């Protein structure tokens, strides 16, 4: 709202009010279009979603009319004037917008206008976010339903960071009927999605694409391929080809398309997220927000949380060795709070279909974890049905995770992705179970066996596929698969990274009002 003192005649002041009525109405609407995108995502420079249903009305010749001859009314609801609000985008900078409201009132005409700089967070949505690798970021076959973001090595922007010549497919849809009886773990609205919002981004480096590689499909194809310094760093036999089961099928194709892009999140760097931004490091955050937190320096197991609640010796017995393996004997790491709330994790064994409930977030430092049998999970943190398990390194020991059986959420409790269990591993992750449904972070590398599929997302410094569980050699030629399933920001494991494309800004660069007639 803008208030000022004047000595102008009543006539011109009413012309100003008419215009200022238009500007401040649609400055609010413009800001509201800015908050609706901080909640598929498309930038403001490509139009507005005036409905708020995904229908975008674009800018024509950099201009978009928001209101033509709309009338301003007095307190009694009679016409005092008309105004016309027009929204203009800058030809050069796709973040600069000018809102203009020409007003008229009783034969007096006034014009007021404001320039904004608007940029959205653009929460990154990819099946695989890769880090810095070893000079290899994805090794071995893969079929990725979702985006793949790779950061690369800033001190070598000439390194092919993806030399896919076959053995690699990246799609922008999935349907969960194609997998063995896992559809009853996911919410109806989430079982077949045809817009995954996939893209290929590589911040530092080049990429090569050879025959039978498939970045998108002729029908449903990827929403952009933004690599390195420009379109120059998109090499290969298959660029511009978009025939079926070959080539790069893309809408847009240039260089890395992000300002303020996020670095690979690491335990020892600040992680600016709704839960962890106050702490100096992501690790300090996990440590401090953990419900259950156990450390292990050599043979000592020191409990650091819950500091005012008791544990069962069964719980601490299980991690004696420095490796928590679940398998065939139940382990109860829960405790009860002051107010009758539970905390920790509990792992029952059935004979059939196991259970691992997690109440709040739990982090084990200097401890490895292996879940050696299929297990259903249930997780909550008071209101929300989400939680995190962290295995962190401590003195170079621990921090690895092994999921050798299936790992799904329990249908009874909740359904994906309104029910998710997240995994932070500072070391490596090896999945030999056929189906695990979780968002996953591996500070080191994330290994997976041909044939097994992970639903959720992997953030990891390296991704690798292997021929068999026996193996740890990355050279593989068959395919593992990752299926990106968006998890809504609410009911998302708080202690996981929330990677943003850019910084959120809604800032006024200038404001002006001119009288144009009497």
Author numbering: 1 to 39, 49 to 142, 144 to 528
Task: Reproduce, without paraphrasing, sentences from the article in which this PDB structure was first reported.
Natural competence is the term used to describe the uptake of “naked” extracellular DNA by bacteria; it plays a significant role in horizontal genetic exchange. Previous work on T. thermophilus HB27 by Friedrich et al. identified a locus containing five open reading frames (ORFs) associated with natural competence. Four ORFs (pilA1 to pilA4 [pilA1-4]) were type IVa pilin-like genes, and a fifth, comZ, encoded an unusual and much larger protein that lacked some of the sequence features characteristic of pilin genes. Mutation of pilA1-3 and comZ leads to a loss of natural competence, although piliation is maintained.
